[PDB]
Design a protein around this ligand. Structure first.
Ligand SMILES: [Cl-]
Ligand SMILES: [Cl-]
Ligand SMILES: [Cl-]
Ligand SMILES: [Cl-]
Ligand SMILES: [Cl-]
Ligand SMILES: [Cl-]
Ligand SMILES: [Mg+2]
Ligand SMILES: [Mg+2]
Ligand SMILES: [Mg+2]
Ligand SMILES: [Mg+2]
Ligand SMILES: [Mg+2]
Ligand SMILES: [Mg+2]
Ligand SMILES: [Mg+2]
Ligand SMILES: [Mg+2]
Ligand SMILES: [Mg+2]
Ligand SMILES: [Mg+2]
Ligand SMILES: [Mg+2]
Ligand SMILES: [Mg+2]
Ligand SMILES: [Mg+2]
Ligand SMILES: [Mg+2]
Ligand SMILES: [Mg+2]
Ligand SMILES: [Mg+2]
Ligand SMILES: [Mg+2]
Ligand SMILES: [Mg+2]
Ligand SMILES: [Mg+2]
Ligand SMILES: [Mg+2]
Ligand SMILES: [Mg+2]
Ligand SMILES: [Mg+2]
Ligand SMILES: [Mg+2]
Ligand SMILES: [Mg+2]
Ligand SMILES: [Mg+2]
Ligand SMILES: [Mg+2]
Ligand SMILES: [Mg+2]
Ligand SMILES: [Mg+2]
Ligand SMILES: [Mg+2]
Ligand SMILES: [Mg+2]
Ligand SMILES: [Mg+2]
Ligand SMILES: [Mg+2]
Ligand SMILES: [Mg+2]
Ligand SMILES: [Mg+2]
Ligand SMILES: [Mg+2]
Ligand SMILES: [Mg+2]
Ligand SMILES: [Mg+2]
Ligand SMILES: [Mg+2]
Ligand SMILES: [Mg+2]
Ligand SMILES: [Mg+2]
Ligand SMILES: [Mg+2]
Ligand SMILES: [Mg+2]
Ligand SMILES: [Mg+2]
Ligand SMILES: [Mg+2]
Ligand SMILES: [Mg+2]
Ligand SMILES: [Mg+2]
Ligand SMILES: [Mg+2]
Ligand SMILES: [Mg+2]
Ligand SMILES: [Mg+2]
Ligand SMILES: [Mg+2]
Ligand SMILES: [Mg+2]
Ligand SMILES: [Mg+2]
Ligand SMILES: [Mg+2]
Ligand SMILES: [Mg+2]
Ligand SMILES: [Mg+2]
Ligand SMILES: [Mg+2]
Ligand SMILES: [Mg+2]
Ligand SMILES: [Mg+2]
Ligand SMILES: [Mg+2]
Ligand SMILES: [Mg+2]
Ligand SMILES: [Mg+2]
Ligand SMILES: [Mg+2]
Ligand SMILES: [Mg+2]
Ligand SMILES: [Mg+2]
Ligand SMILES: [Mg+2]
Ligand SMILES: [Mg+2]
Ligand SMILES: [Mg+2]
Ligand SMILES: [Mg+2]
Ligand SMILES: [Mg+2]
Ligand SMILES: [Mg+2]
Ligand SMILES: [Mg+2]
Ligand SMILES: [Mg+2]
Ligand SMILES: [Mg+2]
Ligand SMILES: [Mg+2]
Ligand SMILES: [Mg+2]
Ligand SMILES: [Mg+2]
Ligand SMILES: [Mg+2]
Ligand SMILES: [Mg+2]
Lengths: 189, 148
RNA sequence: CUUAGUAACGGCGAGUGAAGCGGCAAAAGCUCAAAUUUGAAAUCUGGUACCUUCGGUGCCCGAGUUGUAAUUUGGAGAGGGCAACUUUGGGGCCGUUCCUUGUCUAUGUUCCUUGGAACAGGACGUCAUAGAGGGUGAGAAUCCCGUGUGGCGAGGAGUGCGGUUCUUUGUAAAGUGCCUUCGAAGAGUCGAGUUGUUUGGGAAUGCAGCUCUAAGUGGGUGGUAAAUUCCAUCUAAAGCUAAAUAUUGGCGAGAGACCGAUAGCGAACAAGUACAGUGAUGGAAAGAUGAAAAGAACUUUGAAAAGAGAGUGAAAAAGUACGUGAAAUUGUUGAAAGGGAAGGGCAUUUGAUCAGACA
RNA sequence: GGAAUACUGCCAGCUGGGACUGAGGACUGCGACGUAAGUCAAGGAUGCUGGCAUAAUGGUUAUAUGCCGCCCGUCUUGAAACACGGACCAAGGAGUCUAACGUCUAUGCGAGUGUUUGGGUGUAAAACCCAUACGCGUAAUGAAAGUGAACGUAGGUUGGGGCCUCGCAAGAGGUGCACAAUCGACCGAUCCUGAUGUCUUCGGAUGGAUUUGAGUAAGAGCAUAGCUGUUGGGACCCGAAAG
RNA sequence: GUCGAAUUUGGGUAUAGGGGCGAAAGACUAAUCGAACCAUCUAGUAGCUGGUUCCUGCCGAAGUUUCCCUCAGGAUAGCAG
RNA sequence: AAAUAUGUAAGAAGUCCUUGUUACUUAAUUGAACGUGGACAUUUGAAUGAAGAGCUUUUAGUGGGCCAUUUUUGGUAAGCAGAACUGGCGAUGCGGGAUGAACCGAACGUAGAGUUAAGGUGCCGGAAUACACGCUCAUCAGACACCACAAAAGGUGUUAG
RNA sequence: GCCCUGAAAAUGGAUGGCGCUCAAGCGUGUUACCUAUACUCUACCGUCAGGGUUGAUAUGAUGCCCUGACGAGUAGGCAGGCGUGGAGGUCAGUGACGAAGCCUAGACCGUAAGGUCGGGUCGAACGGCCUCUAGUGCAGAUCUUGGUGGUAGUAGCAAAUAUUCAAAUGAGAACUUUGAAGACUGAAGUGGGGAAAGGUUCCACGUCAACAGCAGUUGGACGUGGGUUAGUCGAUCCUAAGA
RNA sequence: GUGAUUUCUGCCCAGUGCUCUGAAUGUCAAAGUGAAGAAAUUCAACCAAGCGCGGGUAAACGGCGGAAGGUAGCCAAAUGCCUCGUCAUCUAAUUAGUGACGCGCAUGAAUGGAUUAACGAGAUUCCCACUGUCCCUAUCUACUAUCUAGCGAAACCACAGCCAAGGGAACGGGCUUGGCAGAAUCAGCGGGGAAAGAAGACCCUGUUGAGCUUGACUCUAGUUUGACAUUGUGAAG
RNA sequence: GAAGACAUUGUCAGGUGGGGAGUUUGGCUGGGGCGGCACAUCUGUUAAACGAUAACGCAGAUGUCCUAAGGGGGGCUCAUG
RNA sequence: GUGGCCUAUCGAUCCUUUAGUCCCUCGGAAUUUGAGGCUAGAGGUGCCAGAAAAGUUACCACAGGGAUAACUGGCUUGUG
RNA sequence: GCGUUGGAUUGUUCACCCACUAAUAGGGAACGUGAGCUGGGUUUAGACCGUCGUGAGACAGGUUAGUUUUACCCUACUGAU
């Protein structure tokens, strides 16, 4: 079953695949269901924004570390710096993540600023039961968007010291490669 | 569509284009890649040299993210500056006003030097750079700032 | 969704084949064991009486110290000392939401022709947030039910919340600052050898049998075995938890460029029926008179079945062997040919039969 | 010695009889005969006359006569075969769909391209609108660490359509895209050479080599659709002895 | 042929499919035995046999080369559109 | 030492004159290779022909063959087995050989007229029971390629030498 | 050279047949004549190639027109078309004054796939054109299901010794009933009871379309009813191999 | 395993099996032990059963020539190729039968040899009786066939049904050339229809099976041997 | 009563194991089988004076041998009569 | 002079092993063993473009084959 | 043209004898003739022996037991309308 100049194919269909075929005929139907579920949840739950405020975090890995995204929740130190407790924060619509730690001052300051702005732009109704009617905003994420931090100005002056960047990369690479062998020689002497 | 296929034209011709002698049997020659070294060797040695055997060294649990490094050549370096600002920078080539280009923010890892850039100073920030790319940048009055 | 038919596995043959990141849907957190309540087992099943009965109170046995409550679960937290403010609990009633139902809410059957029947054609009108669908003697928005838009009811569920109302729960409970001493955290288990199985997991991915069997600045992991030196990251051997996901079964609905009685489920019908097999099992065929039986009174021939008339009907060229009624095959009538086949091609005679222009 | 005739050949010599054909549809051409006007057998038929106007001609059909004609389908070098299926009729009855692809073609946009995972919206499985990512492409080459595409109008030579100049033309000169052959240059691999400097073992400048790559050298691709072809699937339809 | 016995036979009961039972024939085990019957895996695979449904127009072959546990089959080159 | 087959050449990418490059080569500007510039146009280098030449992608069927003339191997031989070149059949009807896949003639759109091929002209059967010179008598005459058979040896049958 | 001897095979027999003898035989020469889907000329169809023509006021520049050549074909390739179920658009299409279907050696168009009309039958839906789509075209597969032939009024309806006369009944009697006669089973029976198995076949009345391979007034058939009585007969109780 | 009784069961233990209170320093698993190494690990010693070595065994499998060389018997026998062997007997004539002979292709001793009264729907030869088996056919009876009334199928069927030769897929109902050829039919008949009944069981092919066998390849239930665990207590050599 | 840390049982290890399981048991070929190798190769011929060319055609050969029997140089000349 | 005067005298992938380079990798960071790569050979497939493989069926089976044997017939006639 | 036989042994074709006779010639017709017979032989399955094979089994070696189906059609032929 090999003839002519054709690419080698790797179609994996030697099992009973026809018994496990999933066609998404209900793609339009499920979109209607999801929109109905969001509409009925917003009316049912509260004039609350239907979602919780999220912090801004740095994406891991060298491939994606140049961008910031939304994390799971604010750290215990971040909520403490904002002047509130973790237990009370959860009831006001703030996500708290106890397993995330703070090591970057810039990220810590940005998340503290987010918590400050959130408390100034919300009204917490009293527990007596008066509850004056207020307009419902359906998205706290849209109210508090996440922006990529600035890195540099548009234009500057050329500051050249005469050192080659290519030379710098080669020397730094060579230093790491021979670090172990050089230390051994010094130890022996 | 079915009405444009050759099946419609073969109606009434007995063999349906498959021939009387050879016929259309189930699997003459085996299924899939059968007989790649025995009776399909010629079709494998040509059109597919290098198929049989192993060459390199293995790599257990390779992550592609460790090897992410898109390359950008110098002939496309000025496309990173928006068009509405390119014209003023080209005509005002001077120090103390050199545009700063963040190649990492545009999704590039290493700067290679292929084409020719205008004789205009420019500050290029990148993770990696080739030897020739830096020379052409400095020849125009620019500088490379290494970042991480 | 992607990573990806990729890393890797494989008589490295045929073939097989994940995972981290990234975007999105949905988002929700938590609690036991290990601590002396020790100036007071503070906890609980059951029985019994009463009551405002998915339960409550009094009383009496029992369970339980070989540990039932309160307090603390690693994000912590606990015992003392000091200084301050902040914050409520459990029910009725009426609304709202949800589900199961009921009822009300437009406009021609006006004229002519055909027909058994007007729901057809022609003429003149009306309603329309209603010209979806079905019925009624043939294609009906306006004849009937419904459809569209709104109104007025009835019976339940859940406390989700929108208002009112009865109780002060409580020398109760919770949160937050600083100082000091502490900070208990799961064993034939982790781990190791070996055997089998399994995985993309390769000096061995998970699982299981047998043997060996830990530690507490410890232990697991960091995808090549080992010794030595560091680093990173979590906290096993105990437990609970909505949504986004699945669904050829069950119940209730809405649909189709699907099939149209040898099709479509085996079954449009007294179908898993009739029937077969000791049994497990196997398993059909079969829909249509007409708008309405108006299903043929009566006369006559025949022992009778029936026939010939008559009659019903728009039609018996619709008679319960029933719409339409093809072919194979058959009867009667008419024409033609025929000395061991028949049929065919080209051409014309003979017979029968027929269109075209009379410009 | 002087003729004739036979045989063969030529005539842009003349003339009688018979058969088949009538394509075309204003004019245009080449000629002929004429002093001329005109005419003609000169780039394809007209003129005159008779009978009948209907089954007379003709069509269809049955039959008769002359000649000819073996049963189709199938495998096969070879079938009318003493090779196989077929008594007859009706209805049913066999290259399909899907995943991933090759070539070619049409369409949109183009160094980009792909709205439909999802969100918004709706006259509600339609239509309309949209962010961030992701896929492919825009860089290759090594087992790998790694490095990474201009000596020069992005090179030279030969052949090149088209365009430009001169020329009545023929031709000559200039410029020459795509494409073809060839010699070079550039990037990676391999084999050598080893400068300025040194954590004295690092660093690898410079210049080479009948070596090697699915490369560079003013990008062509991405998406949808169709015929044909490929592989896995029941896989064009029906069929085993078995397990 | 045999006919008083290793006789003939009714009913009850036991042995079930790689198993049973066999004075032994590969015999018998519900007309089924050199491995029963029933359903499913299963539309099991077949280089082998058969079949494969409308018209007209244009072009128009091969039984040869090399390799194959290849010799009734494929790959490859050729011939063809 | 043939015949038949078979390689190359018959120009512009050619010829000639002058002189530039090099790390090759030479005792040596000696040579080699590649070039600058100049001179010679299509009787520009034999014949004939040329439904124009060149080039690319993709894919079907096929991969059992067989026959005739000539060359040829095994075999007593075979309608046997196996090769060489060409033409055919297969895939192909039509006229002829009575009949036949392969022989002879000729290859095919639908018609009319004319002329022929191979083969024929007593009758079947379209066409001369034509013409001319001879031969042959058979109590098993003979009669047309492939082809459907006859030999050695004899006759004072008859004819010619 | 011709002829003869040499020269023997099995159904009857083949210069193709008849027949032919100064041939209608054999060798050779000269003419006339016959006829292929071949050759020559003309018409028409198609294919391919090279060309002409956008000028409005008249319709197809995929149009119209001029010129030349060509035409075999299995396996196979490609192109232009015909027909079928369903879908979007359109023809303000056809129709109870008759849609679809069916029958029709009646007519017309197309090389063909097919299309159109008249007549008869019939009773409720259906078509043209531009596009979309496929479970889209049958003579065969010892094809599937159903229906129907020739064979053919044919094979046959012959084991178990055997029937005959009269009356009654009835539309109808070789076959029912009664009487008479002749026979058989011959007590290990064609007699009289039961076990298993069957399940109303038992009995009476009514009745003959189907069934009893002839017949039928008869029946184990068809229709409607009636009928099985236990302290002592069995089950029930006991135990057997065994479960 | 052999197969009543009678009589007799010879020789061979090299091979293949089976078996042993036999032998010892051959071969040898895991665990354990020792050495080297920083460890993973490597090396060496020790070492169960079995195997090897040794002995026994044929009414174990089997053998009996030119490990032992066919003994007692028996035979052209159901066992002999040559072979219809040679001689005798039986017949007019015998590839048959019987009795002898034996360098026996290839007889033979519980893979039992030889002989045996009685018995046998067993296989053979001859004789007497008997007969239609035959010479050589004839005749009779019943029921069919046959004809009529009623009733009424099936196999099979491309189309069909007269020959001779020719050529042809090398044996025609059809094609070619000749012979011929006249409606509709009844009872018989087995020449032909290469008649019908079944996708040849023979043979070959297929990278299609199954039953059975074996020191084929690869395994396995069971069994056996060793180690560890179950697994404690006391003493001696 | 017997027996005793031995049997037994559990887990690994060696042997035995057609009792049983699964599978295999070439090709060419004047049918197949037996034989042969025409299956990977070499010389001459068949082979028809380029090249190519078949048969289980004809006559033979190969799976080695050599530190020289390899490389260079010098000197010499063999069989036979 | 890049083995034998010339024309024959021989072998892939996977795996193992050796030589060379002492170069690259073990992917949290190092040193040392070990392992894995790069270049060139050897261990072999003689069915020599290279599956790892014993019989029997007279109890037999299936798909096929007149591509192929056991009868006639046809061609041939050595032999008779 | 007309005849070419009767028997012993063998399944036999063939062969070999006895005997009679004018003579006991050779052949064909799908090696004529099985819906004409017969079934002794060969050539299914049972069984025995010899040799061969470890064995299952083999033997163109011997021996014994082993189902012979259908015509009513067409033609031919024989008779009959
Ligand atoms: Cl086509
Ligand atoms: Cl249903
Ligand atoms: Cl059953
Ligand atoms: Cl590299
Ligand atoms: Cl059972
Ligand atoms: Cl048409
Ligand atoms: Mg065709
Ligand atoms: Mg076919
Ligand atoms: Mg191979
Ligand atoms: Mg798997
Ligand atoms: Mg499992
Ligand atoms: Mg690591
Ligand atoms: Mg590993
Ligand atoms: Mg849980
Ligand atoms: Mg149905
Ligand atoms: Mg009617
Ligand atoms: Mg009717
Ligand atoms: Mg009819
Ligand atoms: Mg006429
Ligand atoms: Mg004819
Ligand atoms: Mg054949
Ligand atoms: Mg045929
Ligand atoms: Mg066949
Ligand atoms: Mg048939
Ligand atoms: Mg049909
Ligand atoms: Mg099947
Ligand atoms: Mg199997
Ligand atoms: Mg047997
Ligand atoms: Mg049975
Ligand atoms: Mg199928
Ligand atoms: Mg052609
Ligand atoms: Mg075939
Ligand atoms: Mg073939
Ligand atoms: Mg063919
Ligand atoms: Mg002839
Ligand atoms: Mg004539
Ligand atoms: Mg003559
Ligand atoms: Mg002609
Ligand atoms: Mg053609
Ligand atoms: Mg009508
Ligand atoms: Mg008709
Ligand atoms: Mg109606
Ligand atoms: Mg279909
Ligand atoms: Mg048809
Ligand atoms: Mg049909
Ligand atoms: Mg067909
Ligand atoms: Mg049929
Ligand atoms: Mg009869
Ligand atoms: Mg009978
Ligand atoms: Mg009787
Ligand atoms: Mg009696
Ligand atoms: Mg009696
Ligand atoms: Mg009764
Ligand atoms: Mg009857
Ligand atoms: Mg009756
Ligand atoms: Mg005895
Ligand atoms: Mg003897
Ligand atoms: Mg004797
Ligand atoms: Mg003995
Ligand atoms: Mg004949
Ligand atoms: Mg013949
Ligand atoms: Mg016939
Ligand atoms: Mg004939
Ligand atoms: Mg005739
Ligand atoms: Mg017959
Ligand atoms: Mg067969
Ligand atoms: Mg068969
Ligand atoms: Mg094969
Ligand atoms: Mg098998
Ligand atoms: Mg155990
Ligand atoms: Mg076995
Ligand atoms: Mg073979
Ligand atoms: Mg040559
Ligand atoms: Mg030498
Ligand atoms: Mg080979
Ligand atoms: Mg043959
Ligand atoms: Mg002779
Ligand atoms: Mg015979
Ligand atoms: Mg017979
Ligand atoms: Mg016969
Ligand atoms: Mg017969
Ligand atoms: Mg016999
Ligand atoms: Mg037998
Ligand atoms: Mg019989």
């Amino acid at each position: 079953a090999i003839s002519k100049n054709l690419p080698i194919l790797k179609n994996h269909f030697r099992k009973h695949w026809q018994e496990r075929v999933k066609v998404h005929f209900d793609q339009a139907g499920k979109k209607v269901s999801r929109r109905n579920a969001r509409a009925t949840r917003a009316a049912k739950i509260a004039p609350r924004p239907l979602d919780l405020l999220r912090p801004v975090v740095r994406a891991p890995t060298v491939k994606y570390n140049r961008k910031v995204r939304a994390g799971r929740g604010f750290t215990l130190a971040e909520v403490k710096a904002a002047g509130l407790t973790a237990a009370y924060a959860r009831t006001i619509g703030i996500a708290v993540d106890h397993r995330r730690q703070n090591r970057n001052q810039e990220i810590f300051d940005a998340n503290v600023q987010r918590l400050k702005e959130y408390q100034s732009k919300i009204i917490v109704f009293p527990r007596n039961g008066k509850a004056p009617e207020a307009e419902q905003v359906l998205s706290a994420a849209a109210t508090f968007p996440i922006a990529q931090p600035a890195t540099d100005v548009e234009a500057r002056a050329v500051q050249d010291n005469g050192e080659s960047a290519f030379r710098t990369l080669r020397l730094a690479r060579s230093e790491k490669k021979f670090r172990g062998i050089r230390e051994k020689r010094a130890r022996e002497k | 569509p079915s009405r444009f296929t050759k099946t419609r034209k073969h109606r009434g011709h007995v063999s349906a284009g498959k021939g009387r002698i050879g016929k259309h049997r189930k699997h003459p020659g085996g299924r899939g890649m059968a007989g790649g070294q025995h009776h399909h060797r010629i079709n494998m040695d040509k059109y597919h040299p290098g198929y049989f055997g192993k060459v390199g060294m293995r790599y257990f649990h390779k992550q592609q993210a460790h090897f992410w490094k898109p390359v950008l050549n110098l002939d496309k370096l000025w496309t990173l500056i928006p068009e509405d600002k390119r014209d003023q920078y080209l005509k005002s080539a001077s120090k103390e006003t050199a545009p700063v280009i963040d190649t990492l923010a545009a999704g590039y890892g290493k700067i290679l030097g292929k084409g020719r850039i205008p004789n205009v100073p420019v500050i290029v920030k990148a993770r990696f750079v080739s030897k020739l790319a830096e020379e052409k940048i400095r020849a125009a009055g620019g500088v490379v700032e290494l970042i991480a």
